[PDB]
């Protein structure tokens, strides 16, 4: 929702940095000589940076050794195909994706090879455990930049993620429009929290991810990306328990579009049922168990299987957990619909209150000057004769006598 | 254009529900015993919902 407030970064900028280093003369030979004995090695390049190195396929020691003397049984044909197919598929994946592929496919790096790279990675055992149990997610957060094909090796860099922040508390915020419930059509006003998305504690502050679609979830673990995040103060959490706190100005979005919708949460469902829309919450055995009244309400997944709003049927998540309903007056009722700023996107609580004070200011001040600025006498008619003051008008003085 | 006015839903919620039902004990054996003869069958799970 607030994804526009994020910055713009270059993702593979690090890998490309290593990539251009391999273009230098002799740099590839250091790797070829390091991997001449074993299949995995550590190489410190010219710029001093140390990188892991891996040889996954050796067609040289096959074509030049097992295949060349015949060219100088049928099984040898199939054996070649099995050895060559990977080189073909790696080629195909590159030739489409313009040299940069993500996620890293199994052809580019098998699970055994990826677990080997994680095992030799220079980080803690906790990170090794995390990356080893969630290799599918690590693949989705990794890149494969094709570098060089120099005499006589093929090379591509696999840009792997480093999880510097682990085991800190996270929480996901879901929001939905909060409108009034009048009978007239255009008479309602609406308000919605825009800060929805993922939040995680990080270095005494909070990392906020407005595009929760980019954060991947496995069990209760959340793999987010700091590149598309925001570093907010710790006080941001107050917006959930006290939206009108002065120490943090919570962001909202105003409108007049009272449409009915539903937001499926992790353990329940929010239903904003406005207008003549019929919204229900149903159970797979009992049937309809709740008919929502006009307004924004909530229903937990404890015993509910479906939630229907209008012509839309949502299936709620059947995850195990305790859901608590916190009572409270909808804050939209705290506003007067006659001075409510209805065109606000990048807004906040204080911006709306200040536009209301400003809109209210001009009326009380215009009345404070104009009412009454007619308590004074105007200018007499500007003709030749003189005019005296009588009642509310300028009487011709010549009438005396 | 008005895509922001839309709600937020979980797409795979139903399939994942059936998935969590399939983790239960004996649930897989009912399927393996049902398909021991033919390749296609209709099976009613523990919660009564019938699935292909």
């Amino acid at each position: 929702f607030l994804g526009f407030l994020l910055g713009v970064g270059s993702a593979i900028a690090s890998g490309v940095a290593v990539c251009k280093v391999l273009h230098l003369e002799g740099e590839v030979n250091k790797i070829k000589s390091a991997l001449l004995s074993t299949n995995k090695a550590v190489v410190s390049l010219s710029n001093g940076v140390s990188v892991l190195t891996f040889k996954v396929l050796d067609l040289k020691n096959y074509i030049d050794k097992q295949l060349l003397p015949i060219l100088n049984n049928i099984e040898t044909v199939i054996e070649f195909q099995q050895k060559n197919n990977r080189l073909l598929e790696i080629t195909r994946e590159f030739s489409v994706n313009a040299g940069v592929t993500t996620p890293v496919s199994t052809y580019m790096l098998t699970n055994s090879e990826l677990l080997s790279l994680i095992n030799d990675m220079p980080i803690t055992n906790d990170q090794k455990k995390l990356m080893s149990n969630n290799v599918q997610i690590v693949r989705q957060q990794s890149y494969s930049i094709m570098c060089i094909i120099k005499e006589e090796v093929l090379a591509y860099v696999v840009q792997l993620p480093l999880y510097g922040v682990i085991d800190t508390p996270c929480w996901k915020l879901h929001t939905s429009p909060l409108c009034t419930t009048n009978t007239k059509e255009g008479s309602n006003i609406c308000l919605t929290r825009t800060d929805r998305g993922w939040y995680c504690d990080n270095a005494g502050s909070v990392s906020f991810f407005p595009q929760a679609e980019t954060c991947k979830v496995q069990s209760n673990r959340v793999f987010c990306d700091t590149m598309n995040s925001l570093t907010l103060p710790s006080e941001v959490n107050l917006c959930n328990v006290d939206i009108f706190n002065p120490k943090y100005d919570c962001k909202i979005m105003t409108s007049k579009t009272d449409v009915s919708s539903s937001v499926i949460t992790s353990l329940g469902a929010i239903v904003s049922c406005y207008g003549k829309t019929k919204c229900t919450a149903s159970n797979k055995n009992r049937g309809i168990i709740k008919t929502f009244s006009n307004g924004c309400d909530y229903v937990s997944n404890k015993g509910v299987d479906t939630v229907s709003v209008g012509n839309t049927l949502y299936y709620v998540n059947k995850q195990e957990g305790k859901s608590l309903y916190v009572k409270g007056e909808p804050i939209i009722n705290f506003y007067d619909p006659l001075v409510f700023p209805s065109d606000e996107f990048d807004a906040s609580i204080s911006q709306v209150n200040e536009k209301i004070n400003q809109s209210l200011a001009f009326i009380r001040k215009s009345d404070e000057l104009l009412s009454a600025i007619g308590g004074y006498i105007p200018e007499a008619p500007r003709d030749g004769q003189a005019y005296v003051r009588k009642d509310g008008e300028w009487v011709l003085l010549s009438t005396f006598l | 254009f008005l895509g922001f006015l839309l709600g937020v839903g979980s797409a795979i919620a139903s399939g994942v529900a059936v998935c969590k039902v399939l983790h239960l004990e004996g649930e897989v054996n009912k399927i393996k015993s049902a398909l021991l003869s033919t390749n296609k069958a209709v099976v009613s799970l523990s919660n009564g919902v019938s699935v292909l």
Partner: antibody
Amino acid sequence: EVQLVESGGGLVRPGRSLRLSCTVSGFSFDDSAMSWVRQAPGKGLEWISFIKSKTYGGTKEYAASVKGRFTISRDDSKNIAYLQMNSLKTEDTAVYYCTRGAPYGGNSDYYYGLDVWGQGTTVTVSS
Amino acid sequence: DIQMTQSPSSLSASVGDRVTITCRTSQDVRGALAWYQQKPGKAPKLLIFDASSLETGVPSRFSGSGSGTVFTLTISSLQPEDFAAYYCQQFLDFPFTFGQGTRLEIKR
């Protein structure tokens, strides 16, 4: 955190009256519905009464065995639920438990079980 | 009222055995069955709600099944803690009548 403490039991003559009081502590009392279930010595569980939340009216639902004799009520101002027992018989001698009805969702007038249970209070009716 | 009938009333079983209690109703309760565990003198504990849904904090060995008229509670691997009384309750309409009860004893 969540607790139901029923009180007011003890000895009472057959044909007299006794008022049980269930104090709720740990959650919102106004949003939740309360129920009374008793267990006679040696016998199984018997459902007695049920009072809905304020949101869904104030409907008191009793069982056939005590309908017309017992009366359930609630005081949301002090988070308490009463069970007024009138015209007591000797068969009413039992352990009285205070329970919370679990709505089929976060808030719904359909209940799937009795969530929280009090520890119970013993009521002996004998002359 | 809706009639509840539990079978059997008494059950003898050892530790690690697989037991199944049955609750028959008179009408179609639309899957509004509840299973409770009551140890002698102590308050009952809600084990299973809806038809098969498990209450939070209940071990995985407790399974609920059945539909319409017949409902089954199953304990896969018995433990010394599971020897108690078990009651089924209907939640279709009032009254929320209870079941007969099932005493679960240690076989000897």
